[PDB]
Amino acid sequence: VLRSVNSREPSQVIFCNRSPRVVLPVWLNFDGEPQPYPTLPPGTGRRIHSYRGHLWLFRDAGTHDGLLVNQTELFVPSLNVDGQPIFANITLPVYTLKERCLQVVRSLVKPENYRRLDIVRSLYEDLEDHPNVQKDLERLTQERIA
Amino acid sequence: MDVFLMIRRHKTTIFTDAKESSTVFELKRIVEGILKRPPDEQRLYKDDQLLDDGKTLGECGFTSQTARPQAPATVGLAFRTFEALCIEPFSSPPELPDVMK
Amino acid sequence: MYVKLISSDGHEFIVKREHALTSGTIKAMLTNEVNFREIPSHVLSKVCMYFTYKVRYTNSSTEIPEFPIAPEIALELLMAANFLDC
Amino acid sequence: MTEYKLVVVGARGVGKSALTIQLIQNHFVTIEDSYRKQVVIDGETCLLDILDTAGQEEYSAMRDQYMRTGEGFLCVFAINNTKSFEDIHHYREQIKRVKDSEDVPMVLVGNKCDLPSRTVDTKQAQDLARSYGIPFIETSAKTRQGVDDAFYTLVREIRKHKE
Ligand SMILES: CC(C)[C@@H](C(=O)N1C[C@H](O)C[C@H]1C(=O)NCc1ccc2cnn(C)c2c1)n1nnc2c1CC[C@H](CCCN1CCCN(c3nccc(-c4noc([C@@]5(C)CCCc6sc(N)c(C#N)c65)n4)n3)[C@@H](C)C1)C2
Ligand SMILES: Nc1nc2c(ncn2[C@@H]2O[C@H](COP(=O)(O)OP(=O)(O)CP(=O)(O)O)[C@@H](O)[C@H]2O)c(=O)[nH]1
Ligand SMILES: [Mg+2]
């Protein structure tokens, strides 16, 4: 249900990685499948030639963590006015303290050694639930039911 | 532009914020609003240098770059016949497990 | 309005109530002083820092800094972050 | 002997097929096909694999990975067709997308340099090829003018890119 519109109307966009992570641009095609694009190093910018009605979201390139664009999880380019570009600012979200701790531990322990930790079994499962994008598309559709 | 700090004395620690243009004495009124002690009986320290009651917090080295909310700056506090500034350390973290080396 | 959060080694942290209300566990338990029996000071001091980081950037329109976590605290902090529901 | 897969992209009628036909056979004259010729570049015998793109435009997973196989690209426009020059930007976008890199061995090629009425000035193509950081060469598929130069310079870009 969350898919890009086949507008064929160009719209110049500026992606901007204001995150300390390596950002992975994720385009939602006309069928709803997430298609990744060349990554952005931390603190860079690129003049993307996207099209109106195209869905975008951004994730950490390696850990596939969630990231915010203009203080929201999705980006649709409008129509450029007087040739001006459209700026998409990518920032970190306020990760919950639990989720932030999981991210750090996932980056220090190999997944084979998760069970060798002295944490509770409720957290052993949370470690192995690495973020997938499909469950994020599933909730985002259910979230916009109104 | 706010400056985020930790007012620490003995085993007490206050997590509050203040603008960089606010006075040290103004901060002593905030400490008074928590720790029932007047500003005439307070002695604030940035590291081990006595903060003058007239200077602004920025004039003491507290900036929004060096005093982030996720890592606030420590301000020693001495109450009163004044005491010597004494900040008790936190607990020590345990040794790193071998799986996380 | 300030509340008091005491660690396991007697360290008392004074923090504003709206900052401590971030924790779902602290929210339900209050009614002005809260004690913790197994959370040490070096972990509770970091949690209080997350409360400031939370309220400061939760509606920020610009970029947000990363929340730093040292490896020696990461495992103990995850236990405290799980119990507090924050 | 190492092989170099070269792709020739451009607009309709800019001389993409004609450029390859001379490089292969020295025989100026009609479908999407691939040609191979063994040439010596810089005293080094190497194999050239030229794929002349043609036909309708399509962005399928088949065609993307087929273009991904190419190691270097010739972006060809006609000097008497203003659209072909202002279309070069779109070909470079897709090249950088399928290769998933902003540094791809490329070369801007201005063909049909044997006609009297040019509508695309040489200054426009030098200012554009400078912004892309790629070499520019004026070619002519009728007179072999720079036909060897256009293909050989791309091989030097791939040998430079080798990390
Ligand atoms: C289908 C998608 C490509 C998509 C699209 O563009 N998106 C989706 C997101 O919004 C972002 C945007 C996008 O990717 N930005 C590029 C980009 C690059 C880098 C980065 C890094 N980060 N990011 C985020 C990046 C984004 N999209 N959605 N709607 C449409 C499209 C694409 C364009 C569709 C309509 C164009 C109309 N044309 C017809 C007239 C003539 N034209 C023409 N005539 C003949 C051939 C070609 C041609 N072009 O390429 C090629 C080759 C052979 C060469 C080369 C490699 C490949 S590979 C492949 N399959 C090819 C083919 N056939 C080719 N030949 N062109 C061209 C100039 C216009 C409308
Ligand atoms: N004057 C001149 N005409 C040329 C040159 N190269 C090609 N042409 C002319 O361009 C026309 C089409 O060129 P062609 O080689 O088929 O181009 P193409 O890009 O392969 C076209 P398609 O994409 O449809 O396959 C032919 O009429 C041919 O005579 C050149 O260097 N000079
Ligand atoms: Mg042809």
Residue numbers in the entry:
A (entry chain C): 62 to 207
B (entry chain A): 1 to 80, 84 to 103, 105
C (entry chain B): 17 to 46, 57 to 112
D (entry chain D): 1 to 29, 35 to 168
Task: Please give me the paper's original passages concerning this structure.
Two isomers were revealed to be more efficient degraders, with ACBI4 exhibiting the most promising profile in HiBiT-KRASG12R Cal-62 at the 4 h time point. SPR data also confirmed ACBI4 to induce the most stable ternary complex of the two more active diastereoisomers, for both GCP- and GDP-loaded KRAS (KRASG12D-GCP + VCB: t 1/2 = 3,283 s, K d = 0.9 nM; KRASG12R-GCP + VCB: t 1/2 = 1,863 s, K d = 1.6 nM; KRASG12D-GDP + VCB: t 1/2 = 11,699 s, K d = 0.08 nM), with >35-fold improvement over the initial hit 3 for KRAS­(on)G12D and ∼20-fold for KRAS­(on)G12R. The cooperativity value for the formation of both KRASG12D-GCP + VCB and KRASG12R-GCP + VCB ternary complex also substantially improved, with ACBI4 featuring the largest α value (α = 143 and α = 106, respectively) compared to diastereomer 5c and compound 3 (KRASG12D-GCP α = 60 and α = 4.2 and KRASG12R-GCP α = 89 and α = 7.3, respectively). We consequently aimed to determine the stereochemical configuration of ACBI4 and rationalize what was driving cooperativity by solving its ternary complex structure. We crystallized ternary complexes of VCB-PROTAC-KRASG12D-GDP and -KRASG12R-GCP with ACBI4 and solved the cocrystal structures of both at resolutions of 2.19 Å and 2.85 Å, respectively. We observed that the overall binding mode remained the same as previous PROTAC analogues for both KRASG12D-GDP and KRASG12R-GCP bound structures. At these resolutions, the stereoconfiguration of the isopropyl group could not be unequivocally assigned from the map density. Based on extensive knowledge of the stereochemical preference of the alkylic side chain at that same α-carbon in high-affinity VHL ligands , and our ternary structures of compounds 1, 3, and ACBI3, the α-carbonyl stereocenter bearing the isopropyl group has been assigned as the (S)-configuration in our refined structure. Potent degradation of endogenous KRASG12R was achieved by ACBI4 in the Cal-62 cell line (D max = 93%, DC50 = 162 nM at 18 h), translating to an antiproliferative effect.
